[PDB]
Amino acid sequence: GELFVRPKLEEIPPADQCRGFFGPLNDSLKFLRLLDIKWMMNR
Amino acid sequence: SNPADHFRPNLKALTLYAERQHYVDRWLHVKERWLAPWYLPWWSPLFQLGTWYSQRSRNLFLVENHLSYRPYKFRRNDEDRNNPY
Amino acid sequence: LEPMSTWYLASWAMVWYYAFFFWMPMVWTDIMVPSFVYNKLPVIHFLQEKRAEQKLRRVLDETY
Amino acid sequence: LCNAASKVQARSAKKLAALTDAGIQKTISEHNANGTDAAVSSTKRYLAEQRQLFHYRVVRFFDECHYIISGEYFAQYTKVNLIWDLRFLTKLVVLFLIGTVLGRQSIFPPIDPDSPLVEALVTKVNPNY
Amino acid sequence: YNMLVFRDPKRRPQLSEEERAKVVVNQAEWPEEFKDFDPDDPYKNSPEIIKGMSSWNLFLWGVECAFIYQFYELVFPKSI
Amino acid sequence: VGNGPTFSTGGECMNTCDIQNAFPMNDRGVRSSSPFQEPNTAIYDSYLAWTYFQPMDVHIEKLPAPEAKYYQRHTKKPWDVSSTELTEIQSRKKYFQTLGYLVAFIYLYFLMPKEKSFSGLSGPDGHWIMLPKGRPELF
Amino acid sequence: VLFSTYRSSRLVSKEFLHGPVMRFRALGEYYFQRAWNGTLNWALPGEYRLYAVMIPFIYFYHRWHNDHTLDRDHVEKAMIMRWGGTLEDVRKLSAKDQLRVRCFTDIEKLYSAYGPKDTYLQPPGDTLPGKDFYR
Amino acid sequence: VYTRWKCDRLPVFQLKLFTQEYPMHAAVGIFTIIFLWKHMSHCSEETERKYGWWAGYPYWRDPIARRNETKYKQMIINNDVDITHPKWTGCSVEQLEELSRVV
Amino acid sequence: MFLFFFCDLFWLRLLLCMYYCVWSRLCFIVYFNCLMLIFDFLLFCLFDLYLFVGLCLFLLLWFMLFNLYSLILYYCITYLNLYLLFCIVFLLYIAFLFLFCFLCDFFLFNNLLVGDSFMDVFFIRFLLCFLECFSLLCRCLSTFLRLFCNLLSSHFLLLMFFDFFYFIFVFFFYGVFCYWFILFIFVFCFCLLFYVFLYLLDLFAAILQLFIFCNMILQLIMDFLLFLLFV
Amino acid sequence: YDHLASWGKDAFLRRLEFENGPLRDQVEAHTQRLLAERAAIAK
Amino acid sequence: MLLGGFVPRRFSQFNRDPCWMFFIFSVGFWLGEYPAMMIKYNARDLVYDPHRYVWSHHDDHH
Ligand SMILES: CCCCCCCCCCCCCCCCCC(=O)OC[C@H](COP(=O)([O-])OCC(O)COP(=O)([O-])OC[C@@H](COC(=O)CCCCCCCCCCCCCCCCC)OC(=O)CCCCCCCCCCCCCCCCC)OC(=O)CCCCCCCCCCCCCCCCC
Ligand SMILES: CCCCCCCCCCCCCCCCCC(=O)OC[C@H](COP(=O)([O-])OCC(O)COP(=O)([O-])OC[C@@H](COC(=O)CCCCCCCCCCCCCCCCC)OC(=O)CCCCCCCCCCCCCCCCC)OC(=O)CCCCCCCCCCCCCCCCC
Ligand SMILES: CCCCCCCCCCCCCCCCCC(=O)OC[C@H](COP(=O)([O-])OCC(O)COP(=O)([O-])OC[C@@H](COC(=O)CCCCCCCCCCCCCCCCC)OC(=O)CCCCCCCCCCCCCCCCC)OC(=O)CCCCCCCCCCCCCCCCC
Ligand SMILES: CCCCCCCCCCCCCCCCCC(=O)OC[C@H](COP(=O)([O-])OCC(O)COP(=O)([O-])OC[C@@H](COC(=O)CCCCCCCCCCCCCCCCC)OC(=O)CCCCCCCCCCCCCCCCC)OC(=O)CCCCCCCCCCCCCCCCC
Ligand SMILES: CCCCCCCCCCCCCCCCCC(=O)OC[C@H](COP(=O)([O-])OCC[N+](C)(C)C)OC(=O)CCCCCCCCCCCCCCCCC
Ligand SMILES: CCCCCCCCCCCCCCCCCC(=O)OC[C@H](COP(=O)([O-])OCC[N+](C)(C)C)OC(=O)CCCCCCCCCCCCCCCCC
Ligand SMILES: CCCCCCCC/C=C/CCCCCCCC(=O)OC[C@H](COP(=O)(O)OCCN)OC(=O)CCCCCCC/C=C/CCCCCCCC
Ligand SMILES: CCCCCCCC/C=C\CCCCCCCC(=O)O[C@H](COC(=O)CCCCCCC/C=C/CCCCCCCC)COP(=O)(O)OCCN
């Protein structure tokens, strides 16, 4: 529809804010980010 | 039935038949004749375009190991569902 | 129904493929582009007349 | 049953008044004044003229035959004459076919006794027809 | 008027009533084909393409051709 | 006056078309059917309106012939083909194409038999092609 | 160098067959190059007389082809199947008999879905030959 | 001035049209043509009998059998095929002669 | 198997050669929208958005020469086959789709993921993306199916009605000379009315179907066009 | 268009020349007067 | 597009243009072929084929 402008480096939220299937995969669960498809979709 | 028969091409002139084996072999002979000369090296893109895909497809056919039976492509009768032969 | 058939589909489709690859260029060069050029002619004539009048007007306006 | 009759009469009267032919209007007025029928008078005049022109037709036929036989007709032959002759040929063919059908008094040829179609005649639903 | 889906084109008037009223009509200058010209019947006096060939004659010619087409095999049948 | 055609219109009314300004308007208020100035242009009303121009005998003050220097441009190139020459070429080509199509139409609809007849009295039943020849080792 | 890619490389003179070509173009242009002959996508012209001439001609030649090339096959099949199953058997009949058979086929065509069904369904007790007559 | 449609001859314009104007469409069309002739270019004898004839298959002369007979006769005569070979018959020549004398 | 046959356009080809050896203006186009994609001025597209005009015009001419003239009795629609129409629509639709895909701009497909960030990505947005990707191919299939079915149904109806009219006209006209003549005249008038109505309906429907056929292709093209604003 | 001269003018072409020729004003006046008279008679 | 051309006002005027002359000839053929079929196919001497029950298209298509 309309033109798409890529976000700036400062406009991209941090990875820790993203949520997985059950909950955020923060510290001690970072390596589970690779396996959680929903977390990757949300990211 | 009769109304359905109105929906056919009205200018059919001639029908020719040819076996897949025969014209495939003739095409291969033509391809060999044109790709044989020395002035067309095997590493040229033209030669590989002519040969590689055909080789790959034939290899895929040879490697096939299917648990089901594929009826012959050119049977005399392929309209009977309960007779694959 | 032959419209639902496939036993001579390739030869049947050759009619469309011949129309697309061999007859469309002839219709393109002989019928379509000529008609659209004919449609173009009047507006281009009008605009070029206006451009010539503009040139003459500018020629006159620079005199003093 | 009466309104329809009145409407038809009115329509035909309007159409009769509409025509702008001096001769037709004059004849209609004269016959209306005298109370006679114009159409029947026209028919009688036509038949009288045709009765008096029979030998004119014969003379014209012989003159036309001489004109055709002498070759003068083909000397000035044009495309219009070709069109007329094609029309003439078509009428001749259709008349020959109609004459054959009337002569045998049947649309189709009659079936011979030795033909295998005799059964069809025997198994007619209505022998009267 | 119409003949089936074919409608007779009609020329749009271009003169105003004031200008039109001042026009003097002189049919003596008109062609013989168009005298007492009627928009509802402009071809009433138009000449025939072939003298003596009526529309009914052509219609009947077609009817006779159809009869020949359907009846020729009844008089001159042919074998398979 | 003659019976020849004029600048093509496409069946369009120029008083309501999208390029109407390109067509001059005369005193009567009817836009021309062509880029030229037309005194007797008219509009006819069928299901759709269409503009018509009737050729007529009219005298126009003819400016004298200029010199060839001021209107001739000798920039012709080998690829260039003029519209007159193109019309000639296309006329001849279409004449021959029309004759060929006429012969094809007559043969197709009046002489060519349909293949695979039930009785076998007309048309071919088909046959095999590309059969091997002189290859005993093939069998 | 062998053949030119440009249409300007002429193969004939400008005056070759000028007369016949001009007659052909006169035939084409007289009715088509007119203001009221505005086509719809080049297929439907505006001139009424083009319809009046071309619809009958198209129907006529299509009908001739259908009657003499397409329906003839069905007619011959009916004749062969109903009178012996062989062409020689049909030819053993006379032209009049063949005419009768072909006209009955025409009757069947004209009824089609609305005619009586006794033309192809044998009523019980009918004495005419059945399907196993020639078998 | 130069234009492809007016200056080039028809074959040249055809190549230009399908190479610099509609190359993807030409590619897809060629793809589909290859597919059709690879998978939709065969018809069995039974299919021909069911649907291959305008008025129906004329069993009373069996044109398919005649066509195949001509095909096989031509192949045998041209390729010098010995149809009496044991592989075709499944038995030796002497056994074939014995069968001929028996029947 | 190789069948040799000919199209039913040879007379029309002859007429085209006769009547188009000289130039003529074209002012009426069945699908005019292929020529006017942009309606707001100062908007322009870097994509070749007018590439479809030539194919559209040729397709309209071809389909009109076949479908419109098929109303004449015994005229044959030579291409009337389901899979042949599938091939035609496949060519056009897949060619344009591959033109957009060869662009190698993945952001062009961002709009396939329907919805906003509020909607759950896996259970709502992804399923909508699946359905939309399915809907593109279904649009291709529906286009060709609609074109095939409309022609087939219209001509079946015409054939059946013509057969009925022939039957009653030939085998029941004698009632004009009988005492039940009014019934036959009523039936005959009804048949004439239905005849005219069917012909008008088919004439309108053929052109409408061609319009819709071209509109589907142009809609495919328009779904992926992006317009810049002149400054 | 000399090659068309032999064809002449048909009825429709003659009508167009008559209505749109130098006598166009007279024909227009006559036609409009006749139509007005017929409309008045109809009412 | 049905924009214009010669349009006969009534039957009698069809002979004022060659194209409409051909049209009225064709209309004559069209309408006159029906009476011919009435006469031919409702004839008294028309007889159904005795072997009509030997074979029918209904057998073949079934
Ligand atoms: C199998 C073999 C069998 C063989 C059997 C034997 C064969 C015969 C052998 C000889 C026998 C002895 C001789 C007998 C001769 C009799 C005839 C005779 O002399 O005639 C002269 C006689 C006039 O003589 P006249 O009185 O001295 O005349 C004085 C002037 O000369 C007057 O001059 P004119 O200027 O008036 O000239 C014109 C005049 C003279 O024209 C003629 O001479 C005509 C031709 C004469 C011969 C006719 C023979 C008829 C025999 C039967 C039919 C055979 C086919 C005939 C084909 C004719 C084609 C034109 O025209 C007419 O006569 C017109 C008649 C038709 C009138 C039409 C009006 C219809 C109105 C309907 C309105 C309905 C509204 C309902 C509303 C309801 C609301 C609830 O005319 C007639 O008798 C006319 C008879 C017409 C009968 C037609 C019947 C057709 C079939 C029924 C209709 C079916 C279709 C339509 C149905 C529609 C639904 C309702
Ligand atoms: C400066 C010199 C002055 C000399 C003055 C001389 C004056 C006197 C006259 C001289 C004598 C006459 C000269 C010829 C006149 C021809 C007619 C004419 O005037 O035309 C107008 C025009 C006159 O020339 P121009 O206007 O001055 O210049 C033309 C432009 O420069 C360029 O034109 P364009 O590019 O715009 O268009 C050319 C062409 C487009 O270009 C081509 O078509 C050329 C390429 C075509 C190739 C087709 C074959 C491909 C096969 C596959 C590939 C095979 C590869 C094999 C490899 C090796 C294998 C070992 O356009 C067309 O196709 C449309 C026109 C078609 C004409 C209609 C043809 C049929 C007429 C039938 C009438 C009779 C019916 C039957 C009657 C029966 C009665 C009972 O000529 C042409 O347009 C040329 C047409 C050429 C068509 C060739 C078609 C050949 C088809 C048969 C092939 C047979 C192969 C057999 C192989 C067997 C193997 C077993
Ligand atoms: C001397 C010529 C060059 C010699 C060779 C040179 C060196 C090699 C060149 C490149 C070879 C490519 C190899 C394959 C690459 C991948 C594609 C693929 O899968 O291919 C499958 C298969 C090849 O098989 P393969 O993979 O090599 O291995 C064999 C397998 O065992 C088979 O397994 P299968 O199950 O796939 O087998 C089924 C069947 C499957 O076969 C097919 O599906 C055949 C499809 C043909 C496609 C044609 C493409 C061009 C279309 C142009 C537009 C036409 C529009 C419609 C016109 C209709 C009316 C004519 O395969 C065959 O039997 C192959 C036979 C191929 C014969 C090709 C003959 C072309 C004739 C063109 C006629 C044009 C007439 C225009 C007249 C106009 C006049 C104005 O088909 C093709 O590759 C077809 C395209 C071949 C193009 C060859 C080069 C250009 C054409 C040169 C000859 C021109 C003759 C003109 C005669 C004019 C007479 C008037
Ligand atoms: C064994 C029996 C024989 C058969 C052998 C066959 C071998 C097959 C090999 C295997 C092939 C496998 C694949 C087959 C797939 C088929 C698919 C198919 O049919 O699709 C439907 C599809 C239907 O297309 P369409 O929409 O009908 O349009 C195509 C039409 O051709 C119309 O389209 P168009 O109008 O757009 O075309 C352009 C047209 C533009 O318009 C024109 O040029 C107008 C003319 C049109 C001609 C073409 C139409 C043909 C009409 C029917 C036949 C006409 C009468 C023939 C009379 C025969 C009498 C026995 O220009 C031309 O046609 C250029 C050629 C012009 C020739 C002019 C010759 C003039 C000679 C003058 C001589 C004067 C001598 C004077 C001496 C004086 C001495 C004192 O067909 C095609 O697309 C073409 C399929 C062709 C595939 C290639 C086949 C291989 C080549 C075979 C050539 C055989 C030559 C030897 C025959 C000898 C007699 C027995
Ligand atoms: C009565 C039954 C009715 C059934 C009706 C069923 C529907 C029929 C519909 C027919 C009409 C519509 C057809 C639309 C088109 C369909 C297209 C399609 O599916 O075709 C697929 C088919 C697939 O081909 P294939 O079937 O030969 O696949 C080979 C795969 N093996 C070897 C494993 C068997 O495509 C073709 O037929 C064309 C193949 C040649 C052209 C492409 C060559 C390049 C390939 C690139 C990848 C591989 C090589 C490496 C890269 C390149 C290196 C140089
Ligand atoms: C833009 C809109 C265009 C609308 C055009 C409207 C045309 C109106 C036609 C009125 C009736 C015409 C009757 C013709 C009779 C012919 C003789 C005959 O027997 O026919 C009977 C035939 C069939 O009648 P039938 O079915 O009763 O036949 C009976 C025959 N038996 C019993 C054996 C089965 O009539 C028709 O089929 C006529 C249908 C016409 C429908 C309109 C077609 C329009 C599309 C084609 C346009 C062509 C223009 C080409 C111009 C040049 C192009 C470059
Ligand atoms: C390149 C050939 C090299 C070998 C020598 C072969 C000579 C064979 C004898 C030829 C005698 C007749 C020649 C007639 C004139 C030919 C003129 C010509 O080539 O015109 C091409 C002209 C097309 O013209 P345009 O495309 O418009 O463009 C032309 C200008 N750019 O083609 C035609 O019209 C066809 C003319 C064919 C003539 C015959 C050609 C024969 C060629 C044979 C080569 C093979 C070797 C033969 C050896 C013969 C030994 C006895
Ligand atoms: C040599 C001919 C003489 C002509 C004289 C005709 C006089 C007839 C007067 C009575 C007619 C009505 C009779 C009513 C019953 C008819 C039944 C019927 O169909 O009869 C057929 C005869 O029918 C025909 O062959 C003719 C049918 C109708 C012919 C129509 C004639 C032309 C009509 C032109 C129409 C054009 C438009 C005009 C409109 C005007 C009216 C609205 C024979 O019947 P069977 O032998 O028992 O059955 C055969 C099946 N085994």
Automatic annotation (TrEMBL), chain A:
Name of the molecule in the record: Uncharacterized protein
> Source taxonomy lineage?
Eukaryota, Discoba, Euglenozoa, Kinetoplastea, Metakinetoplastina
Q: Gene name on record? A: Tb07.29K4.425
UniProtKB/TrEMBL annotation, chain B:
Which domain of life does the UniProt lineage start with? Eukaryota
A cellular component annotation (GO) from this entry: mitochondrion
Q: From the Swiss-Prot or TrEMBL record, give the protein name.
A: Uncharacterized protein
Give the originating organism. Answer: Trypanosoma brucei brucei (strain 927/4 GUTat10.1)
Which gene produces this protein?
A: Tb06.3D8.274
From TrEMBL, chain F:
Q: Name one GO cellular component term.
A: mitochondrion
Keyword annotations of the record:
Membrane, Transmembrane, Transmembrane helix
- Segments passing through the bilayer: 95-112
UniProt-recorded name of the protein = Uncharacterized protein
Q: Which organism is it from?
A: Trypanosoma brucei brucei (strain 927/4 GUTat10.1)
Quick one: which gene encodes this?
Tb03.48O8.780
Automatic annotation (TrEMBL), chain G:
- Source organism of the structure: Trypanosoma brucei brucei (strain 927/4 GUTat10.1)
Quote the protein name from its UniProt record: Uncharacterized protein
Q: Which domain of life is it from?
A: Eukaryota
Q: Which GO terms describe its cellular component?
A: kinetoplast; mitochondrion
